[model samples]
Target: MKLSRLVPGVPARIKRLEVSGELHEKLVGMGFVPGEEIEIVQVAPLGDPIVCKIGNRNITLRKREADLIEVEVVGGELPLILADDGTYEITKLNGGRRFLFRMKNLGIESGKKIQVSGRRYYIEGREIDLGYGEATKIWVRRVSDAGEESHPQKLEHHHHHH
Candidate 1:
């Protein structure tokens, strides 16, 4: 299936990429190469742009770009307990009321962006401590832009749509 048609919760491996020029360079630079494992972590409410996980990086791809990449389904999602220390987008809350209450009482939410370092979670500075059991109740996908090449000229104009 084309990467654009991939739904959240399904993991896949990139089989082919049919792009060229600057887009190809950008995608390739972002690790969108064949044989890489990837999965759509989230889709915009309107479905135009999607956030996908490729290795430990999460990339936001416009549908137009997603359309040019082909992939085959692999498997499923990742739980928070198994996540490595990195930035992640919380994808699900598996716990019931008590767990939900515990998480929310600490300001954690499904769509919130968080950084994990050991047993501590940082929601952009405010930190919360979670136990293994509590961590197991949350699901997340990595979201980092660590390897993107920088453009000195574009630094001042960098902007992304919500």
Candidate 2:
């Protein structure tokens, strides 16, 4: 998968650098070779420049530049933008304070369970539409649908969508 498609905070390894020429040399010179561990630190709300950590330094790459690098996400959690239809809990919301405030007003916050269908997010039975940039900024952990045991089932979770 393209690095641009990865969610924030998830560990990913650089698989291949597809850009050829001076840019390629620059990336390799900067130690962004194959097998280097990396993860997105932050993504701009506009999705232009995204911060990625490699080694110890943070590198900022434009949307197009990030697309040139392939990555393999190495965990179960993923960004909401790449999530399939399922129930997920909001793990993290990236960006500035203002962004967090804006999302909070729309019922998007950490620890909240969101239903995703056809790329649309539903919280509390209200459909909240988020753009690609907004979606990428939100990280989610998939909640297993059929495994309910000793966990406290306090809230009546609606499971209308399969």
Candidate 3:
């Protein structure tokens, strides 16, 4: 189905992308393809610009951009990001008391450091696989952005909609 049709704050895998120009090339070079995991990070108040996590990158796209892509619901609503090796600081952690408690025990809280690998995540040297819910709640900013190409760098802006 069209990606724009998916509910907000839901986890979905990229099923297909139907563009063939700049946007297409950009997403192609960034590891977008069938079976690639993704999810809606935030929906703008007016619902035009949407933030999403994919291939360990947080990208913002307009509703028209979303119209060209299709996605299939994965399991949970927590979007997963394919994390690269770097120091990322936690920005927001959205969930219930249980989730926060678990994160606190692991030192995975706001302002904490997050290190990512293919199959593991290190929060202050403690390692574990972040669940969909936990992962979705986690928004981070890379501590260093000097050498790496600007892929999933950091979110310098905040979204305030309730």
Q: Estimate each model's TM-score.
A: 0.46, 0.50, 0.43
Point out where model 2 deviates above 4 Å.
Answer: 77-80, 83-162
Sort the predicted structures by TM-score, highest score first: 2, 1, 3
lDDT of 1 by residue, 1-162 (tens): 566656576788888777677777888899999999998888888866889898788998887777678776564445555554456788888757986887887878767777766677777677876757677667677676454333222111112221
Clashes of 2: 0
User: lDDT of model 1 at residue 2?
Assistant: 66
Q: Candidate 1 at residue 115, lDDT? A: 72
Q: Give the per-residue lDDT of model 2 (tens digit) for 1-162.
A: 576766677788887776777677767776688999888888888765788888889987766666667777678567777764457888887799998888889898678888776557888687877857688778888785643323332111112121
Q: Write the per-residue lDDT of candidate 3 for residues 1-53, one digit (tens) a residue.
A: 45554556667778777666667776677666778877777777886678778
The TM-score obtained by model 3 is 0.43
- CA lDDT, every model vs. true structure: 0.70, 0.73, 0.62
What is the Cα-based TM-score of model 2? 0.50
Model 3 / residue 61 / CA error / Å: 1.1
Residue 29 in candidate 3, Cα distance off native in Å = 3.5
Whose TM-score is greatest here? 2
lDDT of 2: 0.73
